[PDB]
């Protein structure tokens, strides 16, 4: 005879981690009345930690610790012998964009890919914006030039496809959604330089009986070793008329092979080889020796 009627309910605005109790109250209708709940048109999964209290003409959702997994549309269904009725509401809980875990200092290797990590929490999923202060001075943060080589990824991590020395510096990460904004602490990106031979004469001429010096300039992370070779034999110190010497000029190493005196047989290909933990390189110098 008298059908059930549910007292209209609407979920208030909630904060993450609060306690929630929401009753479905069947204020009229002949007994007995069966009251059940759905979430998003399905039974509430036991995984969700929602308690259901069925007390006479009521059924209540009880949640000890509100989390993002509780977001969704909840339906109360009240059925007796005469009729079944439904009432529904949307549970919305929003999370302010929070930096709980900051970005870490990282090493990038010149010429290779680096990802700068920046997961912040927030719902709605926050929009992520990166800033950059070139080099290790007092930071002055500027927008970043996105141009294929530098991209922001879906998870909000910064991709540098081919690191150059100019990428070395402070990076930070700003997050906003409707609820708020946050600005990460900066991290420092160090660009590691594989050993490079940057400069040498391609071909050079000596005179029999005279001193000849040939130099190579190397760059890269220290320690860096420069060795010389003549037609795949290593020029060892014990070699009588050859002297290898090194000097530091700024961040560069200048290696000099001195021959004293030069003989006709010194002519041919010399190589200077630089190695550090990150890489190696070589230069080739053709020596010709003219007559006295
Ligand atoms: C005579 O020797 C010179 C060196 O004294 C040779 O020059 C080299 O020529 C190369 C191609 O022919 C490259 O152009 C190289 O220049 C760069 C490069 O490889 O692009 C410039 C880059 O900016 C530099 N990268 C840095 C500094 O980070 C890169 C780097 O130093 C390499 O590791 C060098 O080993 O060099 C240029 O130096 C001439 O080709 C040679 N000529 C002849 C006739 O033999
Ligand atoms: C829960 O109910 C919402 C409506 O009250 C629903 O949101 C609407 O869905 C529309 C697409 O069908 C569009 O997204 C509108 O912008 C939005 O208001 C929401 O999608 C439902 N949530 C579920 C099923 O999880
Ligand atoms: C953010 O997004 C990146 C997804 O591309 C992820 O990194 C990748 O991991 C891949 C695994 O093989 C491979 O290493 C790619 O080179 C690298 O791009 C990155 O770790 C994600 N960040 C977090 C915090 O999860
Ligand atoms: C970046 O995130 C990935 C994926 O979880 C992680 O494994 C990697 O080592 C991170 N790098 C950091 C935090 O320096
Ligand atoms: Ca329905």
Residue numbers in the entry: 594 to 885
Article, verbatim:
Here, we present the use of the GlycoDelete (GD) HEK cell line for protein crystallization, which produces homogeneous mature-like trisaccharide glycan stubs. The GD cell line is derived from the HEK293S MGAT1−/− cell line and has been transformed with Golgi-resident EndoT (an endo-β-N-acetyl­glucosaminidase similar to EndoH). This enzyme processes the Man5GlcNAc2 glycans, allowing the NG to be further processed by native Golgi-resident enzymes to generate mature-like glycans consisting of one GlcNac (which can be fucosylated), one galactose (Gal) and one sialic acid (Neu5Ac).
Down syndrome cell-adhesion molecule (DSCAM) is a cell-surface glycoprotein with an extensive ectodomain consisting of ten immunoglobulin domains and six fibronectin domains. To further characterize the portion of the ectodomain of human DSCAM that interacts with netrin, we produced a truncated fragment consisting of immunoglobulin domains Ig7, Ig8 and Ig9. GD-derived crystals from the initial condition diffracted to 2.5 Å resolution and further optimization of the conditions resulted in a complete data set from a single crystal at 1.85 Å resolution. The crystal structure of human DSCAMIg7–Ig9 contains one molecule in the asymmetric unit. Clear electron density for the glycan chains was observed in all three Ig domains at residues Asn666, Asn710, Asn748 and Asn795. The predicted glycan at Asn658 was not observed in the electron density. An analysis of the buried surface areas of all of the contacts occurring in the crystal lattice reveals that the most extensive protein interface is formed between Ig7 and a symmetry-related Ig7 domain (830 Å2). When this protein interface is compared with the Ig7–Ig7 interface observed in available Drosophila DSCAM crystal structures, it is remarkably similar. We conclude therefore that the rigidity of the glycan stub substantially contributes to crystal formation, but without disrupting the biologically relevant dimerization of the receptor fragment.
